[model samples]
Target chain A: GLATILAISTATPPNCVIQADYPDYYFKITNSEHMTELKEKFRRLCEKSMIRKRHMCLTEEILKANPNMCLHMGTSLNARQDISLVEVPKLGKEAATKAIKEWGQPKSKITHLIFCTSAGVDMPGADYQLTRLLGLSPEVKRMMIYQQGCYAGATVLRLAKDLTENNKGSRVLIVCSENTVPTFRGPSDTHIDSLVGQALFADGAAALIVGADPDASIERPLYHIVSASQTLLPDSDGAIEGHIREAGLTVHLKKDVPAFFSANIEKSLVDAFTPIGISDWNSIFWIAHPGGPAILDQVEEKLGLRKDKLKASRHVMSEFGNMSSACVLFILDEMRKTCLEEGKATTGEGLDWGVLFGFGPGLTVETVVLRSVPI
Target chain B: GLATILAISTATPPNCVIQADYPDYYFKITNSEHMTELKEKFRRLCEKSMIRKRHMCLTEEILKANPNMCLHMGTSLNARQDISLVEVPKLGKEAATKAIKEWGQPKSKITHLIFCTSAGVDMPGADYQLTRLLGLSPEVKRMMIYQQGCYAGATVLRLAKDLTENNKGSRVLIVCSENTVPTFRGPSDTHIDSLVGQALFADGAAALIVGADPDASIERPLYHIVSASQTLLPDSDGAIEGHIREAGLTVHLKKDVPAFFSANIEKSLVDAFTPIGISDWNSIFWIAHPGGPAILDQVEEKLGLRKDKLKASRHVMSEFGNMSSACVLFILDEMRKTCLEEGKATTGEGLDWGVLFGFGPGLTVETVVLRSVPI
Candidate 1:
């Protein structure tokens, strides 16, 4: 059985923060204006972040009300989790509803739900809440993947492929929603990793409908999932790490994170594609996770790809910042939209085959080989 | 393609706490000796808990050293998380090592890793840490199912089934590890649910090696995963809830949790087995998650099963307490050992067919139909 993606959609919170104005607003709201030097450093990071704008769930008013959340050392997990518990599923429901609409299937047709988020951890998880919000079948089997980092989008896609292929007539709705609210904190001189995370990460939710043996009359295939594989770059455990503590979720991204990806990207791609008879990296399109401008640049340099190949990823990074686990799906959605706008032969920039990469903690790299279906 | 379990193994921490003495020890260590009435109440709950002993990661010295962990209202997440970060994977590595050794295959053959736990949440998760600790291949495809509550055992088995079935030669190592240290806190009259959790929940890990088309000469099929399905009991979301808060992981079990499971379980089982022509419940064996004495009793009463049908489950509960998601696998292992010791025809109590059930938050029920193979 072959699995195919029927639809893709993305949603973001309404509070859009302009990259240029973020530093001043952040410092003012967090009462960190006295740390003028650190503010300047954060500003410089933001300027080079390649993010033009970001949708954030935390507004000035909310931050002002929850002052403890702004303090990096404050015990604020309860406050953050309370907000996340309500927003994670709600945001995911918005995206899933849109994806289902594009899929042209009744919500009840969804047989399985795979929901992932690094932004929140709760029992009767966001999956259950989203299911209720979307009015999905009560019997729909659900898998909640919480606190897996940026590679979660590709991980969920790989799982969707297996689930749909193995169970005929199964339609899996995969939603990866993330909010930076949990990890948001004032800049500190000692925590440069936090500055990098604050500069790069944003809030968004991405949803996709995947199934095998689509109904020929009503269902349309966007991309056929060819194969998916994941590999760890050895000895890179500390490269990208996150922890949930009293201060809520904190991420530590090493300066050499991009290097780890660059070192292993080519080999991982080769291993994934060799059996499928794919070798010319330039021939296929690319849907790389916009972990940061640096990660995309490193991957491009390592693979010797043309500038236009990662435009979708770059565009998503510029528009939405890094939505972590939800970033790759947004990139995939952007690729399809850009291809259609440009009148390309296929959704993957006129190329039939493409590779989608998700990089995150464990220095984990998830590669999914995908084939575009003609519109 | 059919997925078969090649081996099952379980491991627990060295600190075994006698349930009868737990109330006194807990009160003494937490400096809650002044709460004489609550201590008596906890003693009564432990008396009825059906657990004789439980392996715990938290020892008196550790609890004493971390006095803040003794207060339910204190910010103790960082300390609890620190302990869990090390013990979760260390315990899991032990169990996984045992499972791999029993499978009689080189450890390198494990192509995929599915690690589940509700006790902790971290990026570069316990899956990655366990991979490193066990010297697993750098390229092992890892799926970290974090904070997925107690149904995670069946959830991972279902996932392993699809993965192994879809990729013919792949071997999946499924590990479910939990540490109660994260939820350990002083008792309070206002938090009766915490008392329930303290009395019932313990620490342990279970590991299983699952693959399709087993190597007949070297691999032995203990159980064939025939089919797996999951269902959510409607309007039961609040019955069993867990939240990662400033205090750490807190679980709330409502009085009606057992009622919800009993009301929906028979129907869930019928839905899972009717398609396979399995209507005679007495004809097959059982491996139910021992969520609690009350929950197991309800299942027995609802299904009208013979008492011997659940001996394995009860035995595991009596020995290990509720290790959350790891409980079902331990029950499966216990079932197999008992069958072999009693000279039964098959691992499933002399029956060829059996069913495994996992219940957790979201009022989710995972039913897996299994066919036993001769040793």
Candidate 2:
């Protein structure tokens, strides 16, 4: 394999809210005494979402002071630019610092840095700023995969795989971060799709180190990135719409999102697995983008997976609501940790095999098959 | 070799304006009789500008009716969204259709489709829309590199190289489209950078077919991409700023931008050329981005190139202004045609070596070394 997953680290902002507590927070922000029934309906939706907490830059206190923050604060591009300068780098750096520390390599050693994000846009992007923040070389080749939506994590990984596979001794640093804060609107925005998006999406960031080989001295497990591909579902292109507007960005996750995923998940899974010579479903584990509880539910039913197969996906979803492009990496991080905790390591057949996937706009599905092996 | 450039095609919108007519039109739109001196100053600036003509989406009638179209028209995001849906896809498809026609390949044979634009943004992105418009396969993998600014053409080319290098037998369709129509304002926006940007930027789209091998039947020149690299100018991160705001988007190109490129251009050029064993300057052709006439002057002086070396660059700039990310490809297209016209085919020493470069927001420079070989 050309690209090996040497290490992965994840970071979230300090503000964390439990799912049980979000309904009250939602009620406070919307302050919809005129629409009490509507508020209660939203409360029930959050309660059943299965997300226990979310880590996001828009703390309840910050959001409460400005009830309609994203809506009213739309006039200044500098304001959002400022938010990116403070929030994305801090969260991304936190994760990148840990991954570099755990890898025990010099910060100056990273040859390539690729930053992927859809929720926020910045010039001298996260790639350039993080290079300076983390004290990487100014000469580092930077790639910014901006505005690719949720499936961008897989896209970055695919690029990393190609870079490392073609060039010997190349190491790539992939940092994926998203801040739904700039796009956040009150649940009272008047559209059901907007309200659902506000309730489900949040913020987080993750970093992974992809290298041609693993560190021999580190006493840890290694992961190999086998293959990655993205497939767009036909006749389902309009299922999820992310709009960049004068007011602010808005995501309309239509009612058919879960159904679209349910219909296409099997085909995407088969395409990823069949090429890897994987015939039995029981032979591999599963990691999926926790877009929402309904998406995970649909994936479970459609793929005929065991109840525990997607525990990592469910756990991350419970702890942190969908973080857009950053969600899949968090799930993958949790999967690796759980495997290590359970005393799983490489055998003669190598590390445990698993399929990782994320769905986004374009009704796109990004799939990658990975194996966790010992270095 | 992992990748080869098969064919390139470019398309312009219907409306074209000569520079001589622009100053009179500018004064008419601004209607600034009270500030005759300022009007004269702006008119003189356009008069001296080397750009003789520019092809853009906005007709002169449309621009005259709404002088501050991009400024006052910023309230409705749906208005801009509607524009992108109709305009971007059609223009991008026009270029893609031409490129595929030149390559004589089946429209259904494109394995991966990538769309790049800094001047426009769409939800499923122009990538998804163009696929449907061109009648490409639903299974054709899609990638959208959104809002990467002027250097995005080289960025897409860099990616096409990587994807083809790693995935054998895979061909990638790269379409870069930019329309500055929605961001145009009446130069009273207060920033000198904005006014200068208005004078410089225009609209254009380009499509390139990058495959693993050259065509066998066509008696034409083939360009093989040898290497691609992006280097950020140290201590010049803020030289050029692109902002996406409530009032649409604004870009600040600092006075010292030419200086930044002058300082870093040599290093970037060397990095791209060294690996390919390129040393003699006279031995290779050059295509630097025509960001502005003055920027080209600095590149010429700093790189110590012959006056005719950058004629392709100067010609595109003089004719098309700066079409943001699409500028370099226009230059490349002109270069290829000129070579074919002069009967300058590749010799036995493989194809002739050339360096292609572009600069954008990061004060970043993207350079690629390409060779012209026989198909």
- Tell me, by TM-score, which candidate is best: 1
Clash pairs of candidate 1? Answer: none
Predicted model with the maximum lDDT? 1
TM-score of 1: 0.98
Candidate 2: tens digits of C-alpha lDDT, residues B1-375: 648777789999978878888867765665644556756776666766689988878776765554446343334334545565568778888999898888877877788888988765757788888888888877677777877888888888888887887887777899998886556765563565666766777889999989876556751335778888887778886787766665556677664888888877878767777777777665687777886677789878877877887788888989898888898888888877776667666521224788888788777888888776641
Clash count for each candidate, listed in order shown = 0, 2
Instruction: Tell me each candidate's i-RMS in Å.
Output: 0.9, 2.5
- Candidate 1: what lDDT? 0.89
Stretches of candidate 2 above 4 Å error?
A: A64-81, A215-221, A346-351, B60-78, B215-221, B346-351
CA shift of B187, model 1, Å? 0.7
Considering only N, C-alpha and C atoms within 3 Å, which residue pairs clash in candidate 2? A19-A52, A52-A318
For A153-221, candidate 1 gives per-residue lDDT tens digits of 999989999999998899999999998978998778778789888888899999999999989899988
- How does each model score on TM-score? 0.98, 0.94
Residue B316 lDDT, candidate 2, scale 0-100: 91
Model 2 docking tier (incorrect/acceptable/medium/high): medium
